[PDB]
Amino acid sequence: MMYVKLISSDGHEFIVKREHALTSGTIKAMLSGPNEVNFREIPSHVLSKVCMYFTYKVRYTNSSTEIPEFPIAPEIALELLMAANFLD
Amino acid sequence: MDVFLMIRRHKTTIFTDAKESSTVFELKRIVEGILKRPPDEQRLYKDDQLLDDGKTLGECGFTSQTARPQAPATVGLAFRADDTFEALCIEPFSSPPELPDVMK
Amino acid sequence: VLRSVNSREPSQVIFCNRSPRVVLPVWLNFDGEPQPYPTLPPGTGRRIHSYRGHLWLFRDAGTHDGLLVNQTELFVPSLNVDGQPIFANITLPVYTLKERCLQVVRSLVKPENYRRLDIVRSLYEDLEDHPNVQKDLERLTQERIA
Ligand SMILES: Cc1ncsc1-c1ccc(CNC(=O)[C@H]2C[C@@H](O)CN(c3ccccn3)C2=O)cc1
Ligand SMILES: [Cl-]
């Protein structure tokens, strides 16, 4: 299937499935007009967890099975909240 | 059953899924379709052990317990550069800041 | 609108907690008001006595975060066929990343210190809007009419 590249502020490149990245409305808008998106304020320890959320969301949404918890370490919680708010 | 992985090399990470019964070679075919390098120019690792092409991903230790959507397992990747393989180098992610005073 | 029907027809139900949270079962009485029932530790099941048409919802016992029961928000026991109880599988929903983040920041910061966090103003309001059974019932009655 199709893939996109999401670059963090510290230069890490995250290659994720396009369908998975379209979980975020902001990423969908960035790909509709002006397959790479650069995030000047999201560091790699936050953006790697954002990509883990997309696969978690796509795998478990609408599934009739036991849903596991999405874990978030206390050290990243506030920056991940800021990134999730920007990405929707 | 499906296993969820992070194929990592230098500063690039591929988030992908595969079957537990699928082989290390079939995972190199997935990497080929993304980074345009053939399986013969690839070496996949787990921690520091090189993985043999004919083994299943379950036989390497990537199962529903270690490779989850919300907690994916890492597969190291090293490409062939002129008849010789480079040393496995995975750059780590940034360190989070100090835990705020109100969160401590 | 959302209330239990006083059918007086017994129905045996298995409350099966398939979530990592301590679950608070909540029964909506004949006036639509929520009543708390004993809590279920994670991964436990209880065979309970209920009635047909009775309306139940399930929340996290500590934070009141919303939970699903048989993939939906409300559970109504039906007739027991072939001497079998009705299963009410309580599971975590797939929360939005923002909601899960709000859940973790709320579990670590006292509400009086939300304003001390260096975050945008709208995020203070989001943190303060704690999960509330009364609010979600209003949202569900409005969508039940529409
Ligand atoms: C072990 C456990 N763990 C979690 S929850 C629970 C439990 C314990 C005990 C009962 C027993 N049934 C009732 O208490 C209700 C069920 C309701 O559907 C109707 N109702 C009621 C009462 C007063 C007027 C009208 N109806 C009742 O008797 C149930 C769950
Ligand atoms: Cl029981």
Residue numbers in the entry:
A (entry chain B): 16 to 49, 58 to 111
B (entry chain C): 1 to 104
C (entry chain A): 62 to 207
Provide the authors' original text about this structure.
The Von Hippel-Lindau (VHL) E3 ligase is a component of the CUL2-RBX1-ElongingB-ElonginC-VHL cullin-RING ubiquitin ligase complex, and its natural substrates are hypoxia-inducible factor (HIF) proteins hydroxylated at a conserved proline amino acid by prolyl-hydroxylase domain proteins. It is one of the commonly used E3 ligases for proteolysis targeting chimeras (PROTACs), a recent drug modality which holds promise for future therapeutic strategies. PROTACs are bi-functional in nature, linking a moiety that is specific for a target protein with a moiety that is E3 ligase-specific. Currently, the chemical diversity of known VHL-small molecules is limited.
Based on these encouraging results, the diastereomeric mixture of 1 was co-crystallized in complex with VCB. A crystal structure of the compound bound to VHL was obtained at a resolution of 1.98 Å. The well-resolved electron density allowed the identification of the eutomer. The hydroxy-piperidinone motif of 1 occupies the hydroxyproline recognition site of VHL, forming conserved hydrogen bonds to Ser111 and His115. While the RHS motif is conserved compared to reference molecule 1, ring expansion and amide inversion leads to an altered exit vector towards the LHS. Further optimization of 1 to engage in pi-pi interactions with Trp88 and Phe91 from a pyridine substituent can be envisioned. Interestingly, the eutomer observed in the co-crystal structures exhibits the (R,R) configuration, not matching the stereochemistry of the original player-designed compound with the (R,S) configuration, but does maintain the key pharmacophores. The co-crystal structure in complex with the E3 ligase reveals that the observed binding mode matches the player’s original idea. The identified hydroxy-piperidinone core as a bio-isosteric replacement for the classical hydroxyproline motif provides an interesting starting point for further structural extension. 1 was submitted to protein-observed NMR experiments: Protein labeled selectively, with 13C-methyl groups in the residues Ile, Val, Leu, and Met, was used to obtain a KD = 182 ± 76 µM by fitting the dose-dependent shifts.
